[PDB]
Amino acid sequence: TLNGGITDMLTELANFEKNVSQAIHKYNAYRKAASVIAKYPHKIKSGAEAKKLPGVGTKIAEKIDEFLATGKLRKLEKIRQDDTSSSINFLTRVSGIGPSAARKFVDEGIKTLEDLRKNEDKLNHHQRIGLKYFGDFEKRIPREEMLQMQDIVLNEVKKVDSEYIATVCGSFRRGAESSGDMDVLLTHPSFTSESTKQPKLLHQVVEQLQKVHFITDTLSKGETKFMGVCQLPSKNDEKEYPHRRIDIRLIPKDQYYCGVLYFTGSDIFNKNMRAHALEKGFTINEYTIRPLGVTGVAGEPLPVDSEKDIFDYIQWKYREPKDRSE
DNA sequence: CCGACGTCGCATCAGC
DNA sequence: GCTGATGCGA
DNA sequence: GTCGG
Numbered sequence: 001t002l003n004g005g006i007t008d009m010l011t012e013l014a015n016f017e018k019n020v021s022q023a024i025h026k027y028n029a030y031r032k033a034a035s036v037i038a039k040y041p042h043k044i045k046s047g048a049e050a051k052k053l054p055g056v057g058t059k060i061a062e063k064i065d066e067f068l069a070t071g072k073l074r075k076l077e078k079i080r081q082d083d084t085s086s087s088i089n090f091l092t093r094v095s096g097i098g099p100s101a102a103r104k105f106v107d108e109g110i111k112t113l114e115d116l117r118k119n120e121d122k123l124n125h126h127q128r129i130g131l132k133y134f135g136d137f138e139k140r141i142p143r144e145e146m147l148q149m150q151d152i153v154l155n156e157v158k159k160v161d162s163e164y165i166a167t168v169c170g171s172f173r174r175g176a177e178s179s180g181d182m183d184v185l186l187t188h189p190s191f192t193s194e195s196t197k198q199p200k201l202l203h204q205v206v207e208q209l210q211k212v213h214f215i216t217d218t219l220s221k222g223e224t225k226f227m228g229v230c231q232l233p234s235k236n237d238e239k240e241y242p243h244r245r246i247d248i249r250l251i252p253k254d255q256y257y258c259g260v261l262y263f264t265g266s267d268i269f270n271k272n273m274r275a276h277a278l279e280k281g282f283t284i285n286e287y288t289i290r291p292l293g294v295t296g297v298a299g300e301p302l303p304v305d306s307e308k309d310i311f312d313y314i315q316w317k318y319r320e321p322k323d324r325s326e
Numbered sequence: 327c328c329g330a331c332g333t334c335g336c337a338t339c340a341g342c
Numbered sequence: 343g344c345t346g347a348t349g350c351g352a
Numbered sequence: 353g354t355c356g357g
């Protein structure tokens with residue numbers, strides 16, 4: 001990491017703006033600049049050099065100059081001193097506690113892990129599970145464990161219905177040596193953009209994974225998206241593995257390529273690519289790519305028979321999953 | 327100088 | 343209940 | 353906070 005000091009600074013500023021300021025566009029701007037700087041293949045020597053990169057403007061350039069000269073950023077040194085900002089930033093590290101809930105908890109005197117555990121009463125279901133596994137959810141998953149988890153998920157899915165196809169996406173599909181959680185794209189021929197011919201398609205996979213004690217908790221669940229918790233089995237006398245976040249997304253089978261493009265990410269890559277689509281006159285979601293008429297209303301879905309077809313429409317050279325870790 | 331910034335699923339709540 | 347908005351998340 | 357028209 002040539003520029004890790006700068007990128008950490010911008011990331012901390014991004015998180016400040018999201019959690020404390022509740023300024024989602026500043027959050028995205030800071031993360032976009034951190035990402036372009038992270039892939040820049042030179043050790044940055046000045047703010048002016050960084051300002052050449054798209055997403056780095058005047059203000060970030062000045063912060064880079066202060067950071068290069070001093071090793072620090074006074075704006076951040078002060079944010080770290082604000083008790084309210086410290087409290088809010090801590091509380092939002094619990095899954096299910098966002099910017100608004102964190103600020104309300106602080107108002108109510110609930111500011112520390114101690115306070116949260118004393119007040120499970122005041123937590124919704126999601127937050128209660130985020131608190132239960134607070135430590136575990138900050139541990140990363142070695143790719144070796146991702147492979148064991150993939151084996152279980154793919155085999156249990158096959159036992160329910162051999163026509164399911166489960167694909168592990170996220171950073172795993174991008175070839176990362178570790179991942180923050182497990183993301184699973186699911187398809188079944190009974191669920192297409194034209195009809196849903198079988199109910200409970202997601203539910204049946206979730207129940208089977210619960211049956212074998214792989215899924216341990218549910219954060220939210222609907223007809224096409226599961227957000228929950230899972231755990232690898234341990235051997236005799238072994239310490240248990242940490243509990244891990246798992247997301248399962250059921251996507252219409254004929255829309256698999258848009259779905260796997262979405263779920264492979266990264267999230268910044270998707271934002272960048274979707275914004276480029278818009279400048280090229282297209283809109284992309286996890287289901288389709290459609291043209292945008294001058295009216296601004298999306299037209300009919302365009303034929304897609306590969307991930308690369310999506311890149312072709314917007315005049316981008318193809319980028320393998322490994323090259324999408326923005 | 328300023329409007330737009332990616333797109334959408336599930337949980338929650340307010341008004342009717 | 344339904345609908346629409348907001349929060350939080352992918 | 354940055355960018356493009």
Ligand SMILES: Nc1ccn([C@H]2C[C@H](O)[C@@H](COP(=O)(O)OP(=O)(O)[C@@H](Cl)P(=O)(O)O)O2)c(=O)n1
Pocket residue numbers: 169170171172178179180181182183262263264265266267270352
């Ligand atoms: N705001 C977002 C968040 C996620 N996503 C997509 C892209 C992302 O790759 C996918 C899974 O989300 P996750 O937060 O798990 O991101 P990952 O790419 O898997 C890595 Cl941050 P990690 O989960 O391995 O740490 O969902 C998105 O489009 N927009």
Ligand SMILES: Nc1ccn([C@H]2C[C@H](O)[C@@H](COP(=O)(O)O)O2)c(=O)n1
Pocket residue numbers: 165166167185186187253256
């Ligand atoms: N989860 C998945 C994965 C692949 N597929 C289909 C889409 C393609 O037509 C086909 C090609 O397989 P693969 O992409 O794994 O090479 O598999 C699916 O329907 N659901």
Ligand SMILES: [Cl-]
Pocket residue numbers: 022023024025026027
């Ligand atoms: Cl903002």
Ligand SMILES: [Cl-]
Pocket residue numbers: 009071072073074076077
């Ligand atoms: Cl600092």
Ligand SMILES: [Cl-]
Pocket residue numbers: 285287288
């Ligand atoms: Cl669509």
Ligand SMILES: [Mg+2]
Pocket residue numbers: 170171179180181182183
């Ligand atoms: Mg992930």
Ligand SMILES: [Mg+2]
Pocket residue numbers: 331355
């Ligand atoms: Mg723009």
Ligand code: NA
Pocket residue numbers: 050051052053054055056057
């Ligand atoms: Na720039």
Ligand code: NA
Pocket residue numbers: 091092093094095096097098
């Ligand atoms: Na949180």
Ligand code: NA
Pocket residue numbers: 170181182183246247
């Ligand atoms: Na995830």
